Amino acid sequence: VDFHGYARSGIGWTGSGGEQQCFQTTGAQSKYRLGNECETYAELKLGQEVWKEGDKSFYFDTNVAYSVAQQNDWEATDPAFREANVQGKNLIEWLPGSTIWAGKRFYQRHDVHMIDFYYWDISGPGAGLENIDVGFGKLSLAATRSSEAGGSSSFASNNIYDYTNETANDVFDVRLAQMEINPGGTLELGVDYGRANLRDNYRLVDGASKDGWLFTAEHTQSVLKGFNKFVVQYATDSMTSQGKGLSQGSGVAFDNEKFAYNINNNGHMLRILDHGAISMGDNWDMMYVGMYQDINWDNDNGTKWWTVGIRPMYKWTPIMSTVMEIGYDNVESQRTGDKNNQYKITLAQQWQAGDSIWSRPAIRVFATYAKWDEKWGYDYTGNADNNANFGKAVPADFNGGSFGRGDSDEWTFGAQMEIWW
Amino acid sequence: VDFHGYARSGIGWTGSGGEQQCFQTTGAQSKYRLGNECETYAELKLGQEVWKEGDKSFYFDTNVAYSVAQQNDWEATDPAFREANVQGKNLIEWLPGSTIWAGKRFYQRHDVHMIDFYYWDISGPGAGLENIDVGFGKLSLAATRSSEAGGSSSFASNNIYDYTNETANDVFDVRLAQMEINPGGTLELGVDYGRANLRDNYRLVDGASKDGWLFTAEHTQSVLKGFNKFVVQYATDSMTSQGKGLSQGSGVAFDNEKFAYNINNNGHMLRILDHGAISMGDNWDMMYVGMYQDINWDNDNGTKWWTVGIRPMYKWTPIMSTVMEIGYDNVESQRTGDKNNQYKITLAQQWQAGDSIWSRPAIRVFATYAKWDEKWGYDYTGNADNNANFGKAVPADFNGGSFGRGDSDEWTFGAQMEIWW
Amino acid sequence: VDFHGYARSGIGWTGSGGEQQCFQTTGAQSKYRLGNECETYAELKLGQEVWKEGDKSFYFDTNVAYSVAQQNDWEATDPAFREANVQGKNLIEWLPGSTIWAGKRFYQRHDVHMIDFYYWDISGPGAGLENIDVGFGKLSLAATRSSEAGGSSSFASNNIYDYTNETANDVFDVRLAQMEINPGGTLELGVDYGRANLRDNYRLVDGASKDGWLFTAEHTQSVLKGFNKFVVQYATDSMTSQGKGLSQGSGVAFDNEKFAYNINNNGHMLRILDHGAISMGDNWDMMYVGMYQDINWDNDNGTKWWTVGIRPMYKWTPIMSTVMEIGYDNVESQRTGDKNNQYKITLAQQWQAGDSIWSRPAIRVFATYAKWDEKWGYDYTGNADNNANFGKAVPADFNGGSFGRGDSDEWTFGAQMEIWW
Ligand SMILES: OC[C@H]1O[C@H](O[C@H]2[C@H](O)[C@@H](O)[C@@H](O[C@H]3[C@H](O)[C@@H](O)[C@@H](O)O[C@@H]3CO)O[C@@H]2CO)[C@H](O)[C@@H](O)[C@@H]1O
Ligand SMILES: OC[C@H]1O[C@H](O[C@H]2[C@H](O)[C@@H](O)[C@@H](O[C@H]3[C@H](O)[C@@H](O)[C@@H](O)O[C@@H]3CO)O[C@@H]2CO)[C@H](O)[C@@H](O)[C@@H]1O
């Protein structure tokens, strides 16, 4: 049996009082990871090569995820059965070196570690013909699925409350990669086309986006004994809300009281990202991110995001170092023009089973500090039925109430373990 | 650690629209498997031989099942802890080669793959003395348990709504097998006696079946480089409803509104089955089933079922083939004399890690087509309290409403993976 | 992959009728284990040494628990994700042979097998520096966490029903062990200090205990080819209710109707324990316990407990024996002075993969008998709101109703498997 996974777990305290807290800017889709994670998360994989004959082989892989709050010993939970697929390599003579697979599978995800941000991820149930050799590069083809909670109607109503049927969305993906545009660099290009796939007779709301596009282009340059990635992405409509490759063409959301409300995503998104990790000499390592994301919706509720941070590691011993992370966020509401922002600074002393910023297990002892000043928030007060502004960006003092995290401070500290195997 | 299991997973589309659908005749207890399965199901076993001394050994086995809808990546679920038992072989000098075991264990199940139909299965918590050598054959003894949701009353009421206590049922099993009645053939005989085991003072409903019998006789003949099984079974009363060896002597069911209703199973069942797989030459393999099942209940709500289908595999390469399945069902209501029926035809191109119809992993790409015409259905409209005909067979247009699947068509298609290890 | 666990599973019957029952004295915190367990419980561990360099190594461990009722095959359940931690040994040059760890981990538990009683157990999320060599003995340091369901208020109310916020408690532990006070004996000493850690601004009830102490001293003497432990413990206030090392300084409980009620634990506890297992010759083994526990609360609802039992094993063969267990309990209510008591006698014939009372797998076939006479019970009738005596000790006939198990008899029997690996 093969055994792999990821897991993080720990214990912490908040400067002001009680269990530890985590800090994320209202409107941003991420937080600066170090000494700013508040869960025990864990994926346990058990795979195995079940048959081999020369070049031909069949591999079986599975994944079961657990997420608990780590406030107690016995903590019951509903695990997620995230992957169970079979991949057969070299089984098709004519297209050599390629694989065909079917089943639930995490499929070629692209992410940014220090902010735990996945920027191109279409995993889920699916199937595909992977790694076909096109000479100048490798070309892969796949189809995956997602399905939104409700959003379709059995008959034609004018009442959004009748659109409660789960609505399926398909994604068709095509990538061309490992092209050496330059010396040291490579270029990957991909096209994603998604669409809500309606049951015979069902109907979507009026004006629902329905389908959409995501265009990705990623360049990898080898540098300072490490690397640098520069991405640029462009999304359209039903692909703007998730923004990783998955489609939500129905435009209907739901309150905690089962009331349907309208999230319509016609619009577009533009992403410009650059991240990497470089080694400078023998005693330093350092990861870094810089991103600007702009979701512009017709519905006028989009946002414009900016981030930057760096994680420099300095090594006393081959297995003892001092890590430091500094991050800055700033989100501006499309609807109101206000701006929310924050900055965090963490200081940690770790012991890892490695000599790299990328090596783990790791055992940290840290201290984090954050100061934010938010001037807007989302209005989730009331009910999708009571409230008409339900789920819209609204200023910090809108109608004498108060939205957003405010303008304060805080510091937390503790011990943590993190590890991929 | 030992690692074994079963798992199936995939992606599909319905000709008419949306996610894929599966087809099963109303009244039949099975569907023709190929390109007609709509879940990600998976059992993960982790066992181990914990002690051996010569002939003596102690084996530890466990099983944990997962079933999700494969419409998304993160799909939480409550797993079933299905087996955790210990078997010790040769530990009793006097009866050599035999095992004694205790714990939850799948125990000697007999099924029919293409229709995924288990026809003799009494697994659950239990214990037994297995494989005693009686000279002309092997004789095994076991006791397993089941318990129905409610069905007993603390005091004597006349109101069925007072019969809500979980009611336990025990099964006592005896089999005599591996007897060579003829050359190439073998004969197994088994007797099952089950009964509801009431708590001190509790009482069952008036007229409740209470106990019952299942008699099995299975002949296996070696043929065409494969085999053929011919079964004949006979059940009585509290063994007719489940019809695999488990007992339900209480006769009380429950609506989705927690209202008790009366399912009384006094009557009998007669099963005549013949299935097998044969190889004809070097380029063809083919599985086949033929069955006739008649449940006759006093309560007049039984049914009379008929099935036939064949799955012929033709192999282009030692690892690439074209499979085809064709199935026919026809169920007639005891209560109304009407008949429901259907026929399915699937065509698939697979790649397996084998050269057999029985070998897997397998990766299929298929298309299925079905046409049914149902003339009756079960009335589950209303409430066990609102409705008096709750859960009874009723014609297709009974009281202007409509029961059954109707008289239509459909075709689906997709990709799937399936594998036992 | 490393694979370990514990698991017990089986099938049983009650003399009087139905599934088997288990017997525990009202007020006692344990039952005499043999042929007196009614669940399928199982922990499945999968660990692994992920990196080693000479003396230095990093170990990864995990645990997932399942508990089902064994009344059926398919039994769904919510598993508990109990441990996921990383321990790195010898990573700190200056303090050699010591480990530093972080994550959810079972940490140095001390228990009493025949009564399944854990008397010093602070496991949960946490971190620590383990096994520092202090010359005359080994000194370890750790901090673990727990959190009670509710018990804090956002503002200052006088209504206990406003104290519904989960309230966290930290524990700080220090032990000094492996000191050879005498020849053959050793001495461990430990101090535990726990306290509810309130969020900025939240408040506890008036008079809430808040914090507390647990003092442990355990002496182990090597004897009769086995051993003997003699413990003495002393707890104070917020450590008296759990009484194993975990803190509950809030004093607020909840009915099944979400109504807060007051459990206040100011008081103290005194524990005197002596247990062990000895071998006498070659044909006998025998475990034994003797304990006296007195929880004295200001609130006057404490109890005074007494137990004694012995489990003598006599071995026919190196792998076939006859086990016997005899236990006696007697609890007296602090509030009413009444006394509850019981005695059990079990007789079993087992087959184990060992020659010891401590060796398993084991497969038992047994019969148990118990006779009790309880004269008081807890009043859980009504609601924390309806009832004012909710949850208090009350005599057996208080207000014409009836509390406690009464004065009866019973006998059960069956087969079971049990195994740690
Ligand atoms: O295994 C490689 C991978 O390990 C780590 O990624 C894990 C994350 O740490 C963990 O939070 C989780 O990520 C989730 C994202 O937060 C969320 O945006 C969404 O996409 O679901 C994710 C769950 O899959 O899981 C991943 C891995 O399963 C590490 O951060 C990565 O650097 C590394 O690529
Ligand atoms: O492992 C041998 C076994 O593998 C396959 O059987 C699995 C079925 O595919 C799967 O559906 C499931 O069967 C369930 C039945 O549908 C149901 O009638 C009832 O009896 O519960 C069953 C769950 O145990 O599980 C089995 C195996 O666990 C394959 O179909 C068989 O040919 C083969 O014998």
Ligand SMILES: OC[C@H]1O[C@H](O[C@H]2[C@H](O)[C@@H](O)[C@@H](O[C@H]3[C@H](O)[C@@H](O)[C@@H](O)O[C@@H]3CO)O[C@@H]2CO)[C@H](O)[C@@H](O)[C@@H]1O
């Ligand atoms: O693995 C060593 C350990 O095995 C056995 O202990 C298990 C118990 O049999 C099992 O009931 C369970 O114990 C629970 C206690 O009943 C309860 O008081 C509380 O502390 O939670 C416990 C769950 O951890 O689990 C343990 C082991 O996980 C055996 O009894 C012991 O002798 C032995 O030390």
Ligand SMILES: [Mg+2]
């Ligand atoms: Mg659940």
